[PDB]
Amino acid sequence: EREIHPDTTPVYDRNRYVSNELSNAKYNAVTFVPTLLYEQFKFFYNLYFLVVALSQAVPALRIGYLSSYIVPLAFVLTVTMAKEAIDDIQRRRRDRESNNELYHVITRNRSIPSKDLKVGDLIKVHKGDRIPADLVLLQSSEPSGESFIKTDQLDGETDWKLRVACPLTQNLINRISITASAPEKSIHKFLGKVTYKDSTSNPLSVDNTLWANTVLASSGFCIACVVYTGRDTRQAMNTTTAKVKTGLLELEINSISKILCACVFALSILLVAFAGFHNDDWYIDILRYLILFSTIIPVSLRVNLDLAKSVYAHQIEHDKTIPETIVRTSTIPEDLGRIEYLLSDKTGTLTQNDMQLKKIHLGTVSYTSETLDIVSDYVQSLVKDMSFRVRDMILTLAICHNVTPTFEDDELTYQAASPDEIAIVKFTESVGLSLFKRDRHSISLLHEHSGKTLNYEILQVFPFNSDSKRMGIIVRDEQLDEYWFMQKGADTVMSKIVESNDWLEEETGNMAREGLRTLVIGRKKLNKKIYEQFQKEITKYLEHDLELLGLTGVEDKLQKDVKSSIELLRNAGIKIWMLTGDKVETARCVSISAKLISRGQYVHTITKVACLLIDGESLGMFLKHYEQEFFDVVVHLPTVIACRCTPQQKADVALVIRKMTGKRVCCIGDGGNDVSMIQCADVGVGIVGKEGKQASLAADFSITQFCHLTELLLWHGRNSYKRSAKLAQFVMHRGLIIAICQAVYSICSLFEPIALYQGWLMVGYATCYTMAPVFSLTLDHDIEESLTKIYPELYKELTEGKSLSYKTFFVWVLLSLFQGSVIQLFSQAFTSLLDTDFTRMVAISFTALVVNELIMVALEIYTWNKTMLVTEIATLLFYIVSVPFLGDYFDLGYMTTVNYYAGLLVILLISIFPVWTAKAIYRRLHPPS
Ligand code: BEF
Ligand SMILES: [Mg+2]
């Protein structure tokens, strides 16, 4: 229960109810460090380098400089807090640019923003203005009191909802208390009561309410008192709590870093055991060796991953091909590269929700929107036989509807609960005969065109019904005084009752294969006496025999390039689904008209009290009871289509897809009918463009339409995943190659590998001499943006996990074994290892490592830009001018030797020839396309 008094301002303004401000940022100031630290320190490859850094606090485990094990931990902490702090402040900014929308308030007598709006203030909302919160209609501008709200984003419905004002309290201005029930998740149920003086309780229901992201129509203004605001709304109660999202590449890095830790621990144990278990502290040894080997990979991986993710977010949100795209969760820009299941919405996502009557067909000939002059010159002559047939068809289209128009200065606007009739009447006025004032309580319909103003009065009406699919009225002309029964409905209902025609079924099938919601038309000529014979009275008499004029083809307009987008995203192995809270037949028509269901390809259907097309109740009960079996059935169907689903079922479908198969789920949509599934997916994508953008406000990404998901998944995400995989490969290779060089020095000389790279050299390799060409790899792509359309098959080649697999990790480990062994052993052979040639050998080993990395970087570059050819040269020249001028004590040597340069050439050629020839043979046996 919730009782609201609009007059008692302070009792709700100060307290007692939730403020209208919404929150999209997750971390507040007081829990910014514990939540972020506890989220970042569950995974192994963060906790590992944290433990490595904390080890140096103990003086026994001191491997060397304290300015090499504490400063990169501080740097990763600074970068992480900066990234999530920027994300939180940007989320707060994005939320407040939509919290400041101005709304007229009756009691305040001054427009106040949406964030300042409270519960119980009389808001006067105009026609084209988005509803602030959960309003309740108490007064409407129309004398009848009906208002057609536009629930295109509260739920997925594509039809306007008939909302009448409260009949007892519309004529009232006075202050009246509102008592509604406590909030639930029921998006289609409303309960409450309106309280007036002298104990006159009134009933409330869904028919006199407006909800959060709804848009009003069918008026100029209406006096509505807010009842639910903030997180108590029916919109917010259907949104689940957002969870932290870690990419699957993060998990792959976690696993291969776990077994990298196992590998270096085994290498340390081997070195210590081969040493001879001397020095009386074998455990202190193995810990020191483990810290030595595992402090260059696990912390360089973090900086590279984090700043590469920042680079990916910047490069996503600064693309001219995808204008006005927003990255709201920068922790997962590479999950877009491995998406196999996509769960899309229909209204706003696929369809523009603006339907137009495309083709009119009558008498075995068809007229479309193109060549509309013929029907125009036919209708202007209203005041051979096909001319009168067309005239009567346009007359029927302008009479049989249930559109109730309203008047402005100009440019008349139509209002009807079934927008197909609105498309019909817009078509009629485009032909030339325009619908005008209609009573619908008394009997009058005005119409006029290029000629003289017509006039028709109805006699009685039959309302449209869901299970009937029929809409017909009896109308008499004022000028001609003729009784016409004028009646319309669906094809299947009338194919056996309209006439003895022959060409109807073929044309109905032909246009239904185009995804047009066809309506077959009918008209019956009557006189008076039979009418008052009918009026003396079930439905058998009112339907005896009609005359088939023709039928109407009403299309549901799709967004820009949904055909090509769906075809390309199904050519890339992504199993596109379609879950929507909208009706069933229009969902099927949209699916067929979007080529989501191709030619033939029979469609199955389930509705509880190849292809698929399932009702919301059926899917909900199945995923409540028969999870594994039904999901095993549906993974083989090319498309599964859901209808009439609360956001909970779409979120649960995403959860089940990512749980039973363990795969990544993308979910695109707009409005609050798909916020939960966006939050509960592995990737959430939002769409903007209309008066509500809350799904984009709660999403990981944001694009202006559906055509941009093709570039967001097939090109940006795939490149992001490939670049991150190559980055991790190169970082772990450099760490393992220095570890192998140290271990080979340990086996060839019993002192210690810690003594090999001491002081500046190890810090320089860990941070300065190698950080730049990895990010040179970060800015490289194999295929351009223009060719992400012609080759959607490149997206399929990443589904196995060959980029970061155990086999390729062990290939990297074996390659590091080979290359580091070559470097160290050839350095020892060319330097004649002693205690006096130590400087020369460590010099040649470090130079061999550096040039080895700088050549391996140039080997795995697909296309060469000027941000990559320059970075390599900059780092190489930095090393060249940093050997003498900075160190001057370590690794010193003559270095101007012909023998030394030949030795360096040999030790580098032997290291870089296996990888070059392996990629050459892999290119010449598996060419790319
Ligand atoms: F878009 Be789903 F129906 F939540
Ligand atoms: Mg929607």
Numbering used by the authors: 154 to 325, 331 to 541, 560 to 713, 732 to 803, 822 to 1141
Quote the original article:
We obtained cryo-EM 3D maps of Neo1 in the E1-ATP state stabilized by AMPPCP at 5.6-Å resolution, in the E2P-transition state of dephosphorylation stabilized by AlF4− at the 3.1-Å resolution, and in the E2P state as stabilized by BeF3− at 3.2-Å resolution. The bound AlF4− and BeF3− mimic the planar pentavalent transition state of phosphoryl transfer and the covalent phosphorylated E2P ground state, respectively. We first built atomic models into the 3.2-Å resolution map in the E2P state and into the 3.1-Å resolution map in the E2P-transition state. The phosphorylated aspartate is mimicked by the BeF3− moiety in our Neo1 structure. To enter into the E2P state, both the N and A domains swing away from the membrane and pack tightly together. Accompanying this transition, the TMH2 becomes straightened, pointing downwards to allow the A domain movement. Comparison of the Neo1 structures in the E1-ATP and the E2P states shows that the whole TMD and the P domain are superimposable, while the N and A domains have undergone dramatic conformational changes. Furthermore, the conformation and the substrate transport path of Neo1 in the E2P state highly resemble those of the Drs2, Dnf1, ATP8A1, and ATP11C flippases in the same E2P state. A structure-based homology search revealed that Neo1 in the E2P state aligned well with all known P4 ATPase structures in that state, but the best match was with Dnf1. Previous reported Dnf1 structure contained phospholipid molecules in both the substrate entry and exit sites, but we did not capture any endogenous lipid molecules in the Neo1 substrate sites.
